Symmetry: D2
Subunit: 367 residues, 4 copies
């Protein structure tokens, strides 16, 4: 049967799921038109309902989750709500596509997994960077020993939306809503290390609060509780030595994720800000013609082919949500997929909590 | 009144039209959801429409121009059939969204013009590179006098799909079916120059036939009648001196459109291979700190914000079609839009014919 | 026998000649240490020689061509005095290392040729971009058929020292003293094309006068007789189709010579602003990994190894002069060298005069 | 009096001092021709003595150090020898220009300083990266609050001369000859953090031995004792949070030093492999035109002006030794200079020893 979609939340991530569900089939072709049934948010739900192309609206989400025409729930609400909703969804016997993270506290996340395992439907997280075709091609080259045995790995995630110290204090500075850089940014690069290598094993963290306080929109000032920057030395699966840097106050970085991989027979460079390329170095051939090759995303780097039949033309950030949507449908029928499950996400969040502890206790921490 | 859509062509460009029509509403929010009515193809039709979410599949393409429920005709087929099909839609009172070129010869185009100019409807060509938030933004800066008065401009469009000399001869290689690099490629840089600057006044072309012939699919060899590279010196509206290079045999160039613009107070560089950025130099401020600024597409460069709300994240090539499709809709209600009309498309194909002439004649030519 | 050196000119180019002569031995190891004998200038001479470690300072420049102890004459002065001075050195039996251009008019150059061709000595022009280990290496790869047969070539030389329209009119702006962008700039790209490919066969130029006049240093305004930008379509030895762009009014371009070369099996890109690298594309190996390789100058690209023994470290622009100076010495003992002789310099200035002609005449021109 | 130079060692670093001493005056102009007097190394010393332009040779260095015509000793021999020689030099009442490092053991270095302080002449180390004009301009922008208060700093030093696991074992793998990456590479980036900010205060280090063993040239295999890679979290002067990564087996890095600096009002990027540029981001101006500016080395970035009067043309690695030579002469007469003294070098090496300890003791270490 064609899949019946319930979406909760309509902020950017809601829009992006919606665009994804509305497009998988036309792009990919090998599945059943999803049907956009129910949507939740004030009764602006009826307004957005028009925009995104959903049959029903409501401002009760437990009702969406109740609705028997919905098979799949897209949770894209704020962090605090994920646990509550994903669980009510699972319990009501449905599949879950949930935005990162799972929950800000480990035992909540535990509960989410316990449910899901116990549940019957699948449960995925929106770690979309993973789905870039360039990135699947990176995994393949690495897997195939193209650069030999990976010794060292560097990974940077930077933006500058906290750089300006005069923006009003909001939830992204409350410890109880997240650690900061770690919660918000580090999970992506770890999701990448996961996809490519595996989980993290020991960590030690230095963290930065660049600004002691920030104005309140209703007057006065509040202490920043959180950390907008984190630098982590690590060890992954297989004893690979890795450095992670995440920074939310990095002026002039917009959407940067920079990944450098070093092996005994070569190297790889990648940078999200030029999403559609990567650079590959092979210690292979005449020495006077060695160097990194700049390789442009092409139909051979599947599934770029489903989007465009010409190389070097480019996918966009939203294109990555469509592929993730596709892979979610694979799971539903698994069918082998490349998704991140609550099982692996929880494990990822385990590494996050370790990093914070790692900083407060000022010591290496094993996991 | 929500538009009923009619689409001919299932190639990797008809796909683009369907993606576009499917997506506009969700992205932009401020139009009625276009209805997917009629799809035309061989025998594949039935399945294709399954994929592109259409209502009725048929192999008859006049049955399409018939269906009273069709308002817009998307013409996405081989270059030869363009004319006849646009005309049968225009005369039959349907709006036209047509892929370039209008047609191989000036007078079938001249016809197309008058057919539509006399008809009620709107006719648009698919010059999509025009629609980049980045491109829109370069227009504004030029406009605002940020770089001063513009004197010089270079534009290069390169791919390498005709680069391998040992690929079997096909229609791309017949003079019958186009000049080659000129009609296939130079047109895009022309719409770009038309968009920022105006139409071309004086040309002079050199042309290149890299490989005198090619092997034949069923044994032997035909000569190549075409030219896979042109280089053109030019004058435009108010004597902007430009140079234009087109080349389908440029190894390594995958999707390259490179534009440099120079004025009395600065310069602008742009590259389609890094489509979501450009470089701006302003002769301003201490000289110990001037240089090109790498500006990354962001929400402030409309209509990027209708796609993602964070900078540095990237639109793909397909998003260009969604924007175009929005502009066409604007035109139909229209309301001034930024679309290329047949009227202006012609004056471009004018330029291009003059281009091929100034070669064959070995002298300057005027327009 | 160690050469006694004679140098006329103390500008920022005579400096270069002295740096060179001072350095060659230590760098290359395999020549005799050139002796700094005679320096020519105004009244500064005495001090200048103090700086450039010379023996005898004089304001008489014939006294120089006299000194029996002088073997090589370095001519580094304003373009006008070049001819007379090269000739008085050639006829007086001295070797000549002369800065470009030979001279503003074809026949003073034609003279220079015969003067030297009849004389015993060696005469070299300072086309130094030729001498880059990178450039030498591109020659070899082209030679080895790494990119196949070369059909197309673009070359851009840009600076922006004539970019500010409000800089006081000076000699750079008189037709009297040169065509402007053509003699000042296009010559370098010509030596480059001569070095890899050969001499130019057919030209056709467009020229640009960005600013109709300039203010005068002591009040008022003169018209600009010159042209600060030329764009030239061309044919070379065996119909390599080339394009060449020169422009002294290109804001942001500081020291830019950009060369793209395209052949049947690959391409080469190069940029003088990143002088110690280039990019090579080979159509070879799995297509999921082709792209431009960024090769960084290294010891294997002679004679880089005579400067630093580690890759990626960089030669400066001044090192180009040291290499040239070594080649001139090679020529004098000579022994085949890679130097530009008057004989070949002329055929370049030929090209350039033809270049300026094909504009004024508004038609193609042959050589 | 003009300064009298004694050089010990003739391997690359010897050549580079020699070229520096031979050129300072012609480049800079404001000092006294140094005189190249004595040189030490087998009696190949007489061969190199010709090449570099030194009056006397010998294979006894205690004799060079004895020689009363020598005022300055250039020590450029291998690491182990530095202590012995620099001290014998100082004691014999002479100035010292010594290659990094000081000694592989802290108390040896202590002794070197004790001497020097006690001595009468100056004592400098060859931390040349510091002298790049781009780098002096970085310091200036930072000093002048151009990017606000620096919060975070990243610094990478990579090469690939240990990447190939089949190169024979030599001293660079003996613990008693150095830690590896830390000894050889980390001192440069720390020298940079020193120049820009100051000394290091707490550190914690992860270290990589990518290869357990390596062949012996005379047959068999030996355990690698050392570490070819080091990742260090740190805190500098002022509580600035810094990450340092040094790697000698990083395939495709040739001469990379990558520095990223992040402040509350902007950012700076620099990369040694394009030595002649840096990128500067200013949170200053309209938001739709922000981004990093690529600024090319220019006469305004003193003392680029003493090398070339045109921007964007480039200095080379050797050019940096000439400037360091110049600054050494300033010191001799201090006269304010920008040199690194034994006092600051020892302090730098203190941080190195801390980093190693830091790794073996698996804990943060304060300094």
């Amino acid at each position: 049967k064609p899949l019946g979609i319930g979406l909760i939340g309509t902020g950017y991530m809601g829009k992006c799921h919606a665009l994804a569900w509305n497009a998988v089939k036309t792009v990919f072709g090998d599945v059943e038109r999803p049907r956009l049934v129910h949507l939740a948010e004030a009764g602006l739900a009826e307004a957005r309902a028009g925009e995104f192309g959903f049959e029903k609206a409501t401002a009760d989400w437990r009702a969406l989750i109740a609705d028997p025409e919905v098979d799949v729930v897209s949770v894209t609400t704020p962090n605090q709500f994920h646990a509550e909703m994903a669980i009510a969804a699972l319990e009501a016997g449905k599949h879950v596509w949930c935005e990162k993270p799972m929950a800000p506290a480990y035992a909540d996340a535990e509960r989410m997994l316990a449910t899901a395992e116990r549940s019957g439907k699948v449960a995925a997280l929106g770690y979309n960077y993973i789905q870039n075709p360039v990135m699947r091609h990176i995994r393949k080259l690495v897997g195939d020993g193209v650069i030999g045995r990976v010794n060292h790995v560097r990974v940077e995630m930077d933006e500058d939306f906290m750089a300006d110290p005069d923006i009003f204090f909001y939830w992204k500075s409350e410890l109880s809503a997240g650690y900061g850089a770690l919660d918000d940014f580090a999970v992506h690069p770890l999701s990448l290390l996961w996809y490519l290598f595996g989980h993290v094993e020991a960590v030690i963290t230095d963290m930065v609060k660049p600004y002691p306080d920030r104005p309140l929109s209703e007057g006065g000032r509040r202490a920043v509780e959180n950390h907008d920057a984190a630098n982590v030395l690590m060890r992954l699966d297989g004893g690979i030595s890795a450095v992670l840097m995440a920074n939310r106050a990095a002026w002039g970085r917009k959407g940067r994720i920079a990944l450098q991989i070093y092996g005994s027979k070569g190297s790889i460079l990648y940078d999200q800000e030029r999403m559609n390329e990567f650079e590959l170095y092979q210690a292979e051939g005449p020495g006077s013609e060695q160097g990194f090759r700049k390789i442009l995303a092409a139909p051979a780097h599947r599934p770029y082919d489903r989007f465009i039949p010409a190389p070097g033309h480019g996918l966009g950030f939203n294109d990555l949500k469509i592929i993730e949507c596709r892979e979610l449908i694979r799971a539903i029928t698994g069918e082998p997929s490349s998704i991140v499950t609550f099982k692996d996400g929880l494990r990822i969040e385990k590494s996050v909590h370790a990093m914070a502890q790692s900083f407060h206790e000022r010591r290496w921490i094993e996991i």
